[PDB]
Design a protein around this ligand. Structure first.
Ligand code: CLA
Ligand code: CLA
Ligand code: CLA
Ligand code: CLA
Ligand code: CLA
Ligand SMILES: CCCCCCCCCCCCCCCCCC(=O)OC[C@H](CO[C@@H]1O[C@H](CO)[C@H](O)[C@H](O)[C@H]1O)OC(=O)CCCCCCCCCCCCCCCCC
Ligand SMILES: CCCCCCCCCCCCCCCC(=O)OC[C@H](CO[C@@H]1O[C@H](CS(=O)(=O)O)[C@@H](O)[C@H](O)[C@H]1O)OC(=O)CCCCCCCCCCCCCCC
Ligand SMILES: CCCCCCCCCCCCCCCC(=O)OC[C@H](CO[C@@H]1O[C@H](CS(=O)(=O)O)[C@@H](O)[C@H](O)[C@H]1O)OC(=O)CCCCCCCCCCCCCCC
Ligand code: HEC
Ligand SMILES: CCCCCCCCCCCCO[C@@H]1O[C@H](CO)[C@@H](O[C@H]2O[C@H](CO)[C@@H](O)[C@H](O)[C@H]2O)[C@H](O)[C@H]1O
Ligand SMILES: CCCCCCCS[C@@H]1O[C@H](CO)[C@@H](O)[C@H](O)[C@H]1O
Ligand SMILES: CCCCCCCS[C@@H]1O[C@H](CO)[C@@H](O)[C@H](O)[C@H]1O
Ligand SMILES: O=C1C=C(Br)C(=O)C=C1Br
Ligand SMILES: O=C1C=C(Br)C(=O)C=C1Br
Ligand code: OEX
Ligand SMILES: [Ca+2]
Ligand SMILES: [Cl-]
Ligand SMILES: [Cl-]
Lengths: 137, 50, 97, 244, 30, 36, 334, 51, 33, 34
């Protein structure tokens, strides 16, 4: 099996446009996700709130939808609760709260796309292991 | 269900001379929350082993 | 006879839909728009005689009411089961991943 | 003259309810047009009594003293709720929240341990009619709920439970199940308790009252494995009443 | 019965310690 | 409990003082060869 | 002729059947106290709420245990590292419910065993011996400190100290593996090399000396009568033993120097058990065994399991089941 | 009448009712006494008390 | 506890039979000239 | 037959303890110098 262009093709927006990431982008996304996110989201779960995970089906039912690059990039700038009702930048890392989450201070727009692509590609590799928790280790 | 229904042989001899209570709080006259001091049934037994 | 009331409840609509009177709050994540804001309100104002009574929660925005209406088909009500609602278990039932 | 956590920590005072001076023999006026709440209710048990279970079943069973074995972890506190003025002038306290339960284990003479969920959960308690002022003659009497001492996830030593766990005795794979039904099929208790509060001191200026209480409730039944015992709890209480 | 049996064996071992130490065959240089 | 505590404190102090005063009592010289 | 001078002479006397000595002055009362409390508790103590969740575990014979299942149960998690002597309890009944006996036993034992080690130094000095037998004993002693004191300190509770019982020991081992992957820790692996190798070299030395006993007895007598206690001549021929073992492997792999040989026999198990003790004592601060979970990945990113991942699956089963009512939040952080 | 007094008036507590090899406590024989059933009064059809 | 009824006699003979074997041998050793 | 469960150990010890006493005394008699 290989990490092919098809595996690396993921939804860009809610309208159905796709984008094909490079292998460089995939590697960048894993690195940056570990740098800034894995401390709570290792394996696609959420250690400080296990009710919400990073599975694509969960992201699709979020408000606004988060199962695409634009949704995930927007989340990393201005994160919301699952229903979109509350802005949570004060307790979740984001570009808006880079003053209190200093690891976000040096994340570029390009970095956010790479992190978003990692979150979307990894379940295409790992299946239900992604966001599955210890049952699937 | 007093001691003599239960096949007790040395228990009556301790009680005869004044050892009537347990460190666990009961007395052979049916009381609760008594402090027998050291000279409970258990204390008597410990003294004999030593 | 002696019966496990939780297993019995699994044979009712509680085993098929979100029971507004009993189901732990994490289940509202199954559908768009319910969690956490409406889910908190639903659990806080339980129990309900019928599913439509959820629309009578005071303070709802019009969109909030519309989200409830779109999801009534996914809700049910059964009698409150003490074993499911004590211990704050509707807010945290000891299940994580 | 105001104590801090470090003044208190380890002394046991944290399990003690506030007290009032011997000069607190006043009266707190109730305005039937004003709404009130109890901002803090504290219950400090001083005696646990358990009803003996005799064989004869025609002799009157008595409540007997017990030894507390779970240390200074028994008091209910930070309890609050609405204090209604009823049309007949009585007051009704409706408990809404607080640290309103404590697991407690006491020991009978001879060693039998009695666990109970000492509680006033969902307390509704009312005074006598025509309470124009709360005084040292005011009493509260009411009922509360006693849920299962263990909640539904609790697993017994062989892994059996109600909302989780095995549903059989897996170490006896081919034993007959009928004889183990009471141990295998977990059941969740919910019963009623009763409590009386006797006001003994009142600070009219501050809205504070203190007194003695007696409450009666069932003990742990181990998720239906055995019959509970009847427990009587006596102690002192404190409450601060506020306009709300 | 089991408890008595376990404590009995233990007590015999402790008695054996006493004899093996204080009533040992004395080491003699020959 | 108070009496038990006082008793144990006295017992422990006694043995600890024996230990310290014992090793102060010319211990290097308690060997079979050179008296230090 | 003064009493304190006479007393010091008896205490340090080399003629007592059992040496007392100044370490002995602490050792004897502390070990008697620990022994007496242990025996009484093992036989008759009521169940102990080890995990502080009002779920008392029965350890004693009279309360339904046998020799294999019985234990003196560690003190309650509600106590943590707090000092819980008898006079801190409102009653002996409370003291027993909360695991008081465990603290009394392990504290008197650890002090007494430390004094046992100093006593080994002391008598060796009085006998004109070289001093390092006590250094050999420091390996088992450090191991006892590890499981009864250091591991509780690191984890914040004597309820995680090793129980004083046979099945309780196994409980401690299995939970330790779940929480620290001790099997994958190199200090435990050195420990195994220490005790496996100690057992190996024990059998080896035993067999080689026994093989080269000089004929001093007849066909009907035990050959042990060929050695007389305190004789000046060695009783076996180490040149023959070395000639055998050097040919079993090769000449230079074998010891001809008895001093070198016996130093090796001392050093190998002592060093290995030192590392065992340091294993427990550093996993006490959660520096755990190697973690190779999902270390091997194929070209697409599929995890390719190794035997480490199978170990992980076994560890998970231990983790999720242990203390099944004590955890309310998703991470077991101590 | 105190249960205790009635219980003394019962032959199972008579020490001359045993056997050399009937071992153990009295409870092993007739059982662990729970309660007095009360005093039985026997009558014939005519209503005369019988003993 | 519902233990095996043969456990007691099994433990008793397990101790007594080899123990008495050793005592017999020890005592007749002591009594030799 | 519902026999007393302690009957077995009682009979066994009744035989073995005094028999073993006699065997000890006999064998150490035989081994004395002749
Ligand atoms: C050291 C002090 C001491 C004390 C305070 C006790 C106390 C007790 N013993 Mg223990 N005991 C002791 C030493 C002691 N014992 C010793 C050394 C032994 C081994 C011999 C025992 C062996 C023992 C057994 C087997 C038993 C007890 C029992 C008891 C309890 C009942 C007492 C009783 O009924 O005796 C009654 C004593 C007598 C009737 C004595 C009779 C005196 C005779 C008639 C004297 C005749 C000779 C005399 C010289 C005649 C001339 C006298 C002159 C004045 C004219 C009581 C707690 C009983 C118990 O409860 O066990 C748990 C029990 O069964 N004890
Ligand atoms: C050698 C004798 C000896 C020693 C060292 C100990 C030690 C201990 N006992 Mg034990 N005990 C003993 C004999 C001893 N016991 C005997 C004979 C009995 C039967 C009466 C008991 C009955 C007993 C009970 C019932 C209990 C203890 C407990 C304890 C622990 C707490 C003690 C304490 O708080 O003291 C405090 C005393 C002091 C701090 C004063 C010391 C003063 C010296 C002179 C100052 C120097 C101290 C400093 C460390 C210097 C040391 C010098 C050294 C480094 C060279 C401690 C492990 C308790 C325990 O186990 O709790 C878990 C407990 O409940 N003991
Ligand atoms: C089948 C044979 C076998 C072999 C070859 C090994 C070998 C090993 N085991 Mg394993 N083990 C086995 C079966 C075996 N085991 C079984 C059946 C069990 C129970 C299920 C275990 C349980 C076990 C545990 C729990 C551990 C080991 C460990 C080890 C390592 C250290 C062993 C040691 O020091 O022993 C003592 C022996 C000596 C001290 C003598 C020397 C032994 C060395 C290794 C031989 C070197 C010879 C050399 C390479 C040959 C070259 C010749 C030429 C140069 C002249 C070693 C790699 C440890 C480990 O995994 O470390 C990483 C460890 O923690 N073993
Ligand atoms: C073949 C497989 C294998 C082997 C060879 C080992 C080997 C070892 N294990 Mg490992 N282990 C294994 C599998 C294995 N394990 C598995 C599968 C698990 C997970 C379930 C573990 C989890 C594990 C844990 C959690 C621990 C070990 C420890 C050890 C060491 C125990 C011996 C010791 O502590 O000596 C040291 C000596 C002592 C402990 C004795 C102290 C004696 C005192 C000082 C005096 C006592 C006197 C006494 C009360 C009275 C005497 C009698 C009287 C008549 C005088 C030894 C290296 C232990 C260790 O490393 O401890 C440091 C330890 O804590 N293992
Ligand atoms: C004065 C002696 C005495 C007395 C009066 C008692 C009395 C009692 N015992 Mg106690 N006991 C004693 C000594 C005594 N005991 C001793 C020394 C021990 C240690 C072995 C015990 C251990 C003990 C236990 C473990 C129990 C009792 C129990 C009891 C109660 C029931 C007894 C029973 O069933 O006997 C039955 C009597 C017999 C079966 C008679 C035996 C006849 C022998 C075998 C005759 C032997 C003949 C001989 C071989 C011929 C030689 C001939 C040759 C010279 C030619 C009773 C209150 C029981 C109880 O209920 O406790 C709560 C109980 O469980 N006792
Ligand atoms: C080595 C030391 C010796 C080892 C023991 C030797 C073998 C024992 C032989 C005796 C056995 C006797 C009892 C057998 C039946 C049994 O199971 O008992 C069992 C009984 C216990 O009784 C048990 O009690 C239980 C509840 O605790 C249950 O009720 C059981 O059903 C019941 O059997 O044991 C005793 O009571 C022993 C105490 C004996 C006291 C007797 C006093 C009078 C004796 C006088 C004799 C002198 C005359 C002889 C002169 C010549
Ligand atoms: C409740 C208390 C009630 C109070 C009433 C009075 C109580 C008194 C109690 C005295 C008990 C005496 C017992 C003596 C036993 C003895 O050792 O004698 C043997 C020798 C002989 O005594 C030797 O005795 C000689 C004189 S003579 O032979 O005794 O006449 C003397 O010359 C010599 O110096 C001396 O060493 O004594 C010694 O060797 C020195 C003391 C050794 C003590 C060792 C204790 C070890 C405990 C280890 C830890 C616990 C382990 C537990 C299980 C593994
Ligand atoms: C790569 C990085 C750079 C290196 C960094 C290294 C860091 C760690 C270094 C550790 C070195 C430890 C040295 C210890 C020396 C020592 O113990 O001497 C003490 C004695 C002296 O040896 C005896 O020596 C005697 C002469 S004398 O005492 O040395 O003078 C002689 O009589 C006798 O026959 C002989 O056995 O050594 C021995 O007892 C022999 C032990 C032999 C063990 C063989 C197997 C051990 C390894 C298996 C794996
Ligand atoms: C812990 C301190 C966290 C870190 C670091 C990051 N996240 Fe997170 N995340 C965390 C929580 C508690 C939650 C739920 C918040 C809520 O109340 O809703 C989340 C949620 C997300 C989501 C939404 C999941 C979904 O809709 O199903 C996403 C997409 C997400 N987090 C992404 C993300 C990224 C990219 C991070 C690094 C840059 C990151 N998170 C950090 C907790 C924590
Ligand atoms: C922790 C509390 C204790 C702290 C104590 C600090 C002490 C500092 C000053 C120590 C003074 C020295 O006191 C020391 O003790 C005892 C009792 O007096 C003396 O007495 C001793 O003399 C000889 C010395 O060979 C011994 O054989 C004999 O057994 C003993 O009588 C020592 O010879 C003396 O050197
Ligand atoms: C060998 C163990 C010694 C334990 C001693 C326990 C004393 S117990 C103590 O002392 C008196 C007993 O007579 C009583 O007056 C007192 O009420 C009691 O608490
Ligand atoms: C000589 C040492 C004595 C050791 C036993 C002392 C425990 S005391 C013991 O406690 C039990 C449980 O509380 C009671 O059931 C029992 O009646 C009582 O004897
Ligand atoms: O014990 C031993 C005896 C001899 Br000899 C040897 O050569 C090696 C060892 Br290990
Ligand atoms: O691996 C080891 C090496 C040496 Br060297 C030792 O003494 C003990 C062990 Br285990
Ligand atoms: O306590 Mn005995 O074991 Ca050490 O981890 Mn946390 O705590 Mn409990 O869980 Mn896992
Ligand atoms: Ca009043
Ligand atoms: Cl466990
Ligand atoms: Cl937790």
């Amino acid at each position: 099996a290989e990490l092919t262009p098809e595996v690396l093709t993921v939804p860009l927006n809610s309208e159905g446009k796709t984008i094909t990431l490079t292998e460089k982008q995939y590697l960048e996304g894993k690195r940056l996700f570990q740098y800034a996110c894995a401390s709570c989201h290792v394996g696609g779960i959420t250690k400080t709130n296990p009710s919400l995970d990073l599975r694509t089906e969960t992201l699709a039912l979020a408000t606004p939808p988060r199962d695409n690059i634009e949704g995930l990039v927007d989340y990393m700038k201005n994160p919301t609760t699952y229903d979109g009702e509350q802005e949570i930048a004060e307790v979740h890392p984001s570009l808006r709260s880079a003053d209190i989450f200093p690891k976000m201070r040096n994340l570029t727009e390009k970095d956010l796309v790479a992190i978003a692509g990692h979150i979307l590609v990894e379940p295409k590799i790992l299946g239900d292991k992604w966001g599955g928790g210890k049952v699937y280790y | 269900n007093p001691m003599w229904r239960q096949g007790m042989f040395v228990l009556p001899f301790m009680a005869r001379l004044g050892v009537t209570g347990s460190w666990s709080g009961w007395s052979i006259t049916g009381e609760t929350g008594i402090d027998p001091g050291f000279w409970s049934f258990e204390g008597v037994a410990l003294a004999h082993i030593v | 006879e002696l019966v496990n009331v939780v297993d019995e409840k699994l044979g009712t609509a509680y085993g098929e839909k979100i029971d507004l009177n009993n189901t732990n709050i994490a289940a509202f994540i199954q559908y768009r728009g319910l969690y956490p804001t409406l889910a908190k309100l639903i659990v806080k104002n339980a129990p309900y005689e019928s599913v439509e009574d959820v629309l009578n929660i005071p303070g709802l925005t019009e969109r909030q009411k519309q989200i409830l209406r779109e999801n009534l088909e996914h809700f049910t009500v059964t009698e409150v089961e003490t074993a499911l609602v004590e211990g704050g278990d509707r807010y945290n039932n000891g299940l994580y991943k | 003259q105001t104590l801090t956590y470090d003044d208190i920590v380890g002394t046991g005072l944290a399990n003690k309810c506030p007290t009032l001076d011997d000069t607190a023999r006043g009266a707190y006026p109730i305005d039937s047009s004003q709404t009130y709440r109890i901002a803090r209710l504290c219950l400090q048990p001083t005696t646990f009594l358990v009803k003996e279970e005799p064989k004869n079943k025609r002799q009157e069973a008595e409540f007997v003293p017990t030894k507390l074995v779970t240390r200074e972890t028994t008091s209910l506190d930070q309890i609050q709720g609405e204090l209604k003025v009823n049309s007949d002038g009585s007051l009704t306290f409706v408990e809404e929240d607080g640290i309103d339960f404590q697991p407690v284990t006491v020991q009978m003479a001879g060693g039998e341990r009695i666990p109970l969920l000492f509680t006033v959960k969902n307390l509704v308690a009312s005074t006598q009619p025509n309470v124009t002022s709360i005084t040292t003659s005011t009493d509260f009497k009411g009922e509360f709920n006693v849920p299962s001492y263990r909640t539904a996830n609790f697993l017994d030593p062989k892994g059996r439970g109600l909302a989780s766990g095995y549903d059989s005795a897996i170490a006896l794979p081919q034993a007959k199940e009928e004889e183990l039904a009471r141990a295998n099929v977990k059941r969740f208790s919910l019963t009623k308790g009763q409590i009386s509060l006797n006001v003994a001191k009142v600070d009219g200026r501050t809205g504070e009252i203190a007194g003695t209480f007696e409450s009666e409730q069932l003990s742990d039944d181990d998720m239906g494995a055995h019959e509970p015992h009847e427990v009587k709890i006596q102690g002192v209480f404190y409450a601060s009443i506020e306009p709300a | 019965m089991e408890t008595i049996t376990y404590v009995f064996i233990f007590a015999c071992i402790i008695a054996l310690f006493f004899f093996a130490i204080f009533f040992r065959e004395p080491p003699r240089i020959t | 409990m108070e009496t038990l505590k006082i008793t144990v404190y006295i017992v422990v102090t006694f043995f600890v003082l024996l230990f310290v005063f014992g090793f102060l009592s010319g211990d290097p010289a308690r060997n079979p060869k050179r008296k230090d | 002729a003064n009493l304190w001078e006479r007393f010091c002479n008896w205490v340090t006397s080399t003629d007592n059947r059992l040496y007392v000595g100044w370490f002995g002055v602490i050792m004897i009362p502390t070990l008697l106290a620990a022994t007496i409390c242990f025996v009484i508790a093992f036989i008759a103590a009521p169940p102990v709420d080890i995990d502080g969740i009002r779920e008392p575990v029965s350890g004693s014979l009279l309360y339904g245990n046998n020799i294999i299942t019985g234990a003196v149960v560690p003190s309650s998690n509600a106590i943590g590292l707090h000092f819980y002597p008898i006079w801190e309890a409102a009653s002996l009944d409370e003291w027993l419910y909360n695991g008081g006996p465990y603290q009394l036993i392990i504290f008197h034992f650890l002090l007494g065993a430390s004094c046992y080690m100093g006593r080994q130094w002391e008598l060796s000095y009085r006998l004109g011996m070289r001093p390092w037998i006590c250094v050999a004993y420091s390996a088992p002693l450090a191991s006892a400190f590890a499981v009864f004191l250091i591991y509780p300190i690191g984890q914040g509770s004597f309820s995680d100290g090793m129980p004083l019982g046979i099945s309780g020991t196994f409980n401690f081992m299995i939970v330790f593996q779940a929480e620290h992957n001790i099997l994958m820790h190199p200090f435990h692996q050195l420990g195994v090399a220490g005790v496996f190798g100690g057992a190996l070299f024990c059998a080896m030395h035993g067999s080689l000396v026994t093989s080269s006993l000089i004929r001093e007895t007849t066909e009907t007598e035990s050959a042990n009568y060929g050695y007389k206690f305190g004789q000046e001549e060695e009783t076996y021929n180490i040149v023959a033993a070395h000639g055998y073992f050097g040919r079993l492997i090769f000449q230079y792999a074998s010891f001809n120097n008895s001093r070198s040989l016996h130093f090796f026999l001392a050093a190998w198990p002592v060093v290995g058990v030192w590392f065992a003790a340091l294993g427990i004592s550093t996993m006490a601060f959660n520096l755990n065994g190697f973690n190779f979970n999902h270390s091997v990945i194929d070209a697409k990113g599929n995890v390719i399991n190794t035997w480490a991942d199978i170990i992980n699956r076994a560890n998970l089963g231990m983790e999720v089941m242990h203390e099944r009512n004590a955890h309310n939040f998703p991470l077991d952080l101590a | 009448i105190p249960e205790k007094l009635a219980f003394y008036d019962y032959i199972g507590n008579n020490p001359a009712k045993g056997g050399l090899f009937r071992t153990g406590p009295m409870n092993k024989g007739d059982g662990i006494a729970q309660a007095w059933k009360g005093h039985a009064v026997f009558r014939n059809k005519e209503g005369e008390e019988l003993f | 506890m519902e233990v095996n009824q043969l456990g007691l006699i099994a433990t008793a003979l397990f101790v007594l039979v080899p123990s008495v074997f050793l005592i017999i041998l020890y005592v007749q050793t002591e009594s030799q000239q």
